[model samples]
Target: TVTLKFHTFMAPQSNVWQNMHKVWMDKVSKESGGRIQFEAYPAMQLGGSPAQLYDQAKDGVVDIIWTIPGYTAGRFPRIEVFELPFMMTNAEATSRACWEYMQTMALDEFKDTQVLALQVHGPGVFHTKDKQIKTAADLKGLKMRGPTRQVTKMLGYLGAIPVGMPLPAIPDALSKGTIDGAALPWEVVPSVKVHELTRFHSEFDPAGGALYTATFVLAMNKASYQALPPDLRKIIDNNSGLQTSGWLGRVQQAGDAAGRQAALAHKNTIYAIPALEAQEFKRKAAVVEVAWVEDMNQRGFDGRQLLTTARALIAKHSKVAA
Candidate 1:
């Protein structure tokens, strides 16, 4: 029997950690005739912070991990494109696009690991402890915890002070006044208990798209993947790539729904800023994307090509009706 240990930061019930984990495990186990078993740990129960997850997988501390690529900045540059402000429309679309982009342009990025699935969360919106953010001016001097470097830059461009940290630290940061609010998707609001900490939620109008998103990777130890018998390896491969990416994307979208329901139960105040105001924010945030393209170009990649292909894939997948 082959047993794999899967570690994640969210609790067992959180949508991505639990729902996607179960689906992937079941598929692999059944396909392998029960020879493959997954032992799951969530809420960092296995020890270490979320930022250490990739290292754990690499060093064989865990056989597998579900982690945000942006947790450790600059380590995975290519994936940062997904986190650029207003880059995604929905989790499903962005996740699918991520997979496609990886296949075509990011194989080198994950060469060190065996990737099971890659995904991104839904739009990152603001949830603040104070008044609603009706205009870009409202963000002035506000302290906000951003999920990724690009998000941090976006917040800075909008006149907020961006603090960097992992998602698990958000509740403590909010309570201790380390930050006035945070930028994350509705899908993770319940996991971090953001609704209880902040009553005001802000989203962009339909015309503005998503404010930002964080990229995710669920990967296994390279040795573990290579050591699998050919048949088992084939089973795993069959479930990876575009199809599995789409599955994870759907799971994330479901999580967003669940989180929204939880926030509603708490009577959180949710508001969507007008399109014009969102546009102003978008203009300022464009600097991050432009700077990213320049950085990638310096690294010998055609950044413009990557951006175009990524956007095209996102549009293709976004047309799929729920």
Candidate 2:
């Protein structure tokens, strides 16, 4: 049997690990009729930080790796458009948008690896240790940990100090007082132990905007993928692309309900910014997009056009109920 070793930073208990990745492995193995098998190592059990997983895949040290694109900072610059502040409404919509966007525009960014699934997390929510963040003003002087450069800039603009780090490092960073809070989705809190370290959780009103979103890639070593027989390769191809990207995100967002429920059980102070305050947050975050557009244009890509196209694609797939 041919076994694929799946590596990721999230623990085995995390919803994404259990519900999404494992499910993908099972489906692929079944399609291959017992010829394909999988062994998943979570919490980086295979070794290295979240930032190193992409290279592990590219270097052929591992069969596959699930990681965030922003973890490598400037390595995946073009895709940062999806990480821009207030850009995405929900995971499923933006994930498919990202998939299509990559096929048409951002293909060069990941040309080194075989992208199995490109997805995004659910909406970002603010979680703090002691303070309840209800307005943009509440961010002043707080040390916040943001996942990407764009997100770090947004935190800095809101008057907070933004520190960049991988997901697994967050619990230690928070416990040692290295950061005051982090912006993460409910789905991530329990997995990274962020929920245990922070007592206050805040979310934006859907109509106002999302604070930010993250981009993730499930990548395979090019050599490893090419080494497979034509029949096995087809199984992998059959499980990739648009539908895989959107499914990864849709199930991830659905898993958020359970994470939120777990947080509530802890009696954590849960607060959603009122419409007025959420709009204020959105207004402050607008500058982040402006900076991104200017930066991207300087790099020779039309940032404004990319941003507009991303939004249009998202609207087409958004499952937002009326």
Candidate 3:
């Protein structure tokens, strides 16, 4: 018999926990034929910051983890391509693309762990605690919480002072006035009660593409994965890869509309930046890519080729209607 402990930064009540991670855990356990059991820890109950999650899995402190590679900036630069400004369309296709991209271009980034899946959330939006943001100029000097380094850099480029933190820290940061706004996907707004704390929300029209998106990784300790009996390891493998990443992306994005509705229900002000107006924002965000390419070049990777392949994969997968 095997007992696998899964740790995550999201609270037990979070949509991803309830709809994605929990479902994956239960399905895996059931298919294991009673040979496997799981101990789930939400909100980082096992102790340590979100930035430590990858190492936690690599070091075998936890059997498995669902974390954001971007949480630890520069550690997983290749995967950050999907997190770049305006790079994502729908979560489903983009996530599948992310997984495929990782398999080909970023595998070495996770050599220390057994990678199960790679995914991205739906379009990232601006949820402001106080004043509403209408244009890039409006972002000047405002303090905004960013989920990853790429995102924080984009925020800085757009004029906001980026405050980096995990999703779990959003509410308190809002309450204490530590941050004036945050970059979040509509899917997670309700889970973190971001709508409850914020008076305004800003979104990009889907036609223009996502303003930004964050990458997520579900992985296991290499030793723990290898220790499993061949049958159980096969069970894990059966539940992983392209299809699983697509499923995770689909499930996570399904909540976006409802999350947006929660804000309307609260009578909050929500603005979808028109495609034409979004162009300005996108123009300012272009520098994020230049910086990323230069960074990747410095790291000895073909930054231009990497970006070209990433964009191609995303377009290929996106051709199929989600």
Candidate 4:
């Protein structure tokens, strides 16, 4: 049997991690005629922090891992576009688009490892303890937890004090007054226990699909992938790419629903800003996107073309207007 060890930062019950892991393991083993076997470890139980997961996979510390690219900033610049404000729709379209983009543009980012699937989360929204953010002015001077550097910059541009922290730390940070609230997707609300800490949940208007999305990678060790028999490799290949990305998105979308439902059951307030007001927020956040492309250009990459390609791919995959 081909035994594999998979690692992730979330608990075993987390919908995103658990669902994807189950689907992937079952598909591989079934398709490989029982040749594949997997051992799953959650919450960094195997060792190291979330930020070290990629290296763990690359160094053979683990045979595979599920990790966020944004966890280690500047390490994967080209894919940062996916994390930009208002750049993606729901998880499904963006996830598929991310896989497609990686196929064409950011292959170098994963050169050290073998990618099983690359996907992102649904639209990130604000779940706050104080007030609903209905307009750009409402965000003034508020302290917020941003999932990635790009998101933190967008929050700063929109007049909030952006605090950087991993998702798991949000509940404690909010309770301790380190952050007034957090900017995250609904899927993570329950995972991080944001629903228990906050009473307000705010989402953008239709024009702006999502405030931001976090990028994720399910990767395998290069040597492990290459060492597999050709028929087993074919099983992996069949389960990866655009279709698998869409599957991941759907899983996250369902998780978001469950989180929202749990919050609703708790009598939390969920609000959506007016479309016009959201447009204004989008306008204010546009500068972050411009600066990001410029930063990419400074690094000697074709930022303009990359942005164009990313937007085009998203449009092709999503029904939402970009």
Q: Which of 2 and 4 is ahead in TM-score?
A: 2
Regarding TM-score, does 1 or 3 come out ahead? 3
lDDT of 4 by residue, 25-134 (tens): 88889888888888888888988868889999999988999888788878888888999878887688888888989889878878999887888887788888987887
Q: Assess candidate 3 and give its lDDT.
A: 0.91
Could you tell me the lDDT of residue 302 within candidate 2?
85
TM-score of each: 0.95, 0.96, 0.98, 0.95
- Tens-place lDDT per residue, model 1, 42-89, is 899999989899989988998999898888888899888888878887
Per-model C-alpha lDDT, please?
0.85, 0.86, 0.91, 0.84
Task: Please write out the lDDT profile of model 2 over residues 39-147, one tens digit for every residue.
Answer: 7788888778889999998998889999998888788877888888778877888899899888888788899999988999888889999899977888899999988
lDDT of 3 at 86: 93
Give the 10-residue window scoring lowest on summed lDDT in candidate 4: 313-322
- Mark the 10 consecutive residues where model 2 has the least summed lDDT: 313-322
The per-residue C-alpha lDDT of model 4 at residue 176 equals 88
- How much is the lDDT of residue 176 in candidate 2? 93
Q: Kindly report which residue pairs in candidate 3 clash with one another.
A: none
- Model 1: lDDT equals 0.85
